[PDB]
Amino acid sequence: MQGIHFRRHYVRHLPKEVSQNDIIKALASPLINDGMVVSDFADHVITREQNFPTGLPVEPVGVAIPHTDSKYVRQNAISVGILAEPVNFEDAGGEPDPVPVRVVFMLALGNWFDITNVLWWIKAVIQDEDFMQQLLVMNDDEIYQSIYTRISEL
Amino acid sequence: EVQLVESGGGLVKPGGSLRLSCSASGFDFDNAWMTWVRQPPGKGLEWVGRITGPGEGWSVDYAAPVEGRFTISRLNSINFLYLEMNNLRMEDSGLYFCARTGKYYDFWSGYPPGEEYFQDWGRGTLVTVSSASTKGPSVFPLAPSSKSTSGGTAALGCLVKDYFPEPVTVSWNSGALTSGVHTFPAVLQSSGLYSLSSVVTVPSSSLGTQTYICNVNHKPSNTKVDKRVEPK
Amino acid sequence: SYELTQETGVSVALGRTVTITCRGDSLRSHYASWYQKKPGQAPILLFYGKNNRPSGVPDRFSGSASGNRASLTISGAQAEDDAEYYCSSRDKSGSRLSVFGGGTKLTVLSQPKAAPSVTLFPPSSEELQANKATLVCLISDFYPGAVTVAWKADSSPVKAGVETTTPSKQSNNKYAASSYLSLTPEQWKSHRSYSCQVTHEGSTVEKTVAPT
């Protein structure tokens, strides 16, 4: 319905010894609580990540954008994780080397026009090296405010 | 085997309205984006408009010359797509296609909102917007000749003279005779009327026993003709 | 070819390779998709995006893209590739609307010459009884698809009354056409003969009918 819901509790720092699935369940958790996705959303993102990985080997901060099928989404939402230390995602391009991910953009979008808008915003944002480093030092409020400003465009 | 079947096309006066239908089977219609496309007579494909899916609240977009006048809707419970056309113009005339529509966006190189492509298509339904009144054909027998055919065979046929608008369909012996028949594309005469011919090649030995009848249907004038063709 | 411009027409010898192009400012931001179409038949999605080919599409079809140009290369053109080809994309960078190119007619110079069959029918008795009269000349199975049709009243040429279709492709990739000469019953009964004269590649067949 064109809007993207992004709330202050959709931004979190994660503990160190978290696996890939741990991350995915933790980022999907506030989306589930808010009723923005089906209740077993994490399972679908996990299963999708295994066959179609979402790691982007960009420098200096590795990124992933895990997601699943739009038919599991109820309202557009985005969920953001900051990793204490890298966790490998497989490379979205089919390179053998894993991606040491520090920043995770979980996407729960059901509108095609919002999907493409967000993907394009992410490609731009991850090439802003100052901004990507900032994400590793800012707290949750500064991350939310920072992303909110840049996303609000549409 | 995806199936798309358009219907509703016909003769309309300029200023008039018309409602097209698109029957759809063989895929997930309820989630499919659906596009209407048209081909004016002798020209190319022209994008008319497109309706999205549930994730997009079923939004619709229209080609510039068509906005306000045309309406694209759908009833998912019966897998039907519709196109409502009002205040029709000459240049709205054409073959109207419906098409299951896919969406593409390449992450590294793409630009919002990506691109839409058309993976499945129906056969179309013909719209004629015009001042002229419908006219039914006159059907004439083309008597059997062996002059241009091979040995023990003859050609005979039907002349479907002066009808408007297209289309006409011709069968033979109510569909029982299908091999050897060639129905030629209509000519558009300097009168605005069409004429086509249909011929079948048959064994010369059968001419005295086997009766031959062409079945001409001109739906726009609600005219059906069964014409006996006999030896001369 | 408004926002997206295609070559009007291109030809290619059977077996050889041809690239057709699609040009417009929106292609600087958007990929194009490609469609084949023949008269009387539904279009067919050949290619789309960066490098996607639907299954069932022969691998001799390949798209690419550069600057404001999208292109479809056909590597080793077959006879059945003789058709119209259409490109499609956004009408504008960032637009939710879509648009087609004006289309390219691709002629495949295929098989050698094939001479036309010419069948000429006289006015039926029924048509004369309705005070009209129509001679019907049917032409088929010729190649290439160009032909000249003249009509004669006796040995004199006939200008008016004549309507002739543009040639159309059969299911066997040869062509068909038809020509009608419309006249009054008086004109039909007035002359000794009428002839339909068909010329194809410097060769002529003439068929004559007479009142009898």
Report on this model:
- The complex is a heterotrimer of chains A (154), B (232) and C (212).
- Chain A is of the alpha/beta class.
- Chain A has helices spanning 20-33, 41-51, 112-125, 129-137, 140-151, and strands at 11-14, 55-56, 62-64, 77-89, 99-108.
- Chain A has a 5-stranded mixed β-sheet with strand order 1-4-5-3-2, with helices on both faces.
- The longest helix of chain A is centred in the N-terminal third of the chain and has 14 residues, at 20-33.
- Chain A is globular and about 35 Å long.
- Chain B is mainly beta and 232 residues long.
- Chain B folds into 2 domains: 1-131, Sandwich (Immunoglobulin-like), CATH 2.60.40.10; 132-232, Immunoglobulin-like.
- Chain B has no helices and 19 strands.
- In chain B, the strands form 4 sheets. In chain B, strands 2, 4, 5, 6, 9, 10 and 11 form a 7-stranded mixed β-sheet that branches. In chain B, strands 12, 13, 15, 16 and 17 form a 5-stranded antiparallel β-sheet that branches.
- In chain B, β7 (70-75) and β8 (80-85) form a beta hairpin.
- Chain C is mainly beta and 212 residues long.
- Chain C has 2 domains: 1-110, Immunoglobulins (Immunoglobulin-like, Sandwich); 111-212, Immunoglobulins (Immunoglobulin-like), CATH 2.60.40.10.
- Chain C has 2 helices and 19 strands.
- In chain C, the strands form 4 sheets. In chain C, strands 2, 4, 5, 8, 9 and 10 form a 6-stranded mixed β-sheet that branches.
- In chain C, a hairpin with a 6-residue loop joins β4 and β5 (44-47).
- The relative contact order of chain C is 0.17.
- At the A-B interface, α3 of A face loops of B.
- The PDB classes it as immune system.
- Keywords: HIV-1 GP41 mper, 10E8 FAB, lipid membrane, immune system.
- The assembly is trimeric.
